[PDB]
Amino acid sequence: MELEIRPLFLVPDTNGFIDHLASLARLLESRKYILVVPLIVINELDGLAKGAGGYARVVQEKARKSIEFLEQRFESRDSCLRALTSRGNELESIAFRSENNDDLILSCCLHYCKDKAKDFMIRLLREVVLLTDDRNLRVKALTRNVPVRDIPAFLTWAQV
């Protein structure tokens, strides 16, 4: 079917923070978009930050910077940043979270795909975009009618 895409909600995966924190930060600072972070992604970053090979320690620092960035932004109750649990409940704070996940990332995107019978009283409005470089994940999104872009491409499009 034909989609009408008007990006509002941006959903990144774990490697977006590792690879592209600066660009996610620029997106969040722009105030144009709501960045929605799956809780599993925060959990994965926690795993990486906690922990070694050189590369592992390089990624560990990147995860630490990510978590630091998210922690600070949730502490200030940043209105353009949300986290979503596995049950589709939004969190306003991540501080005391306890505690291969494509399907959970996708469930987060689909949370913002609010389709109703009467909508087809004709294009499928999609206001969510999955931000990833992972080709398998991208294909999964494509087959679920979730718009998908890599973060550099999106940042270019956004002019922001």
Domain range for 87 is: 1-160
Q: Is 115 annotated as a binding residue?
A: no
- Residue 110 sits in a domain whose CATH number is 3.40.50.1010
Q: Is 133 annotated as a binding residue?
A: no
Q: Which two tokens stand for residue 74?
A: 């949730």
Q: How far apart are CA 40 and CA 123, in angstroms?
A: 31
Q: How far apart are CA 148 and CA 138, in angstroms?
A: 6
The torsion angles phi and psi of 69, rounded to 5 degrees, stand at -65, -50
Number of domains into which the chain is organized:
1
In sequence order, what are the beta bridge partners of 130?
Answer: 11, 148
Q: What are the CA-CA distances from residue 94 to residues 18, 63, 84, 98, 106 (Å)?
A: 19, 15, 10, 9, 20
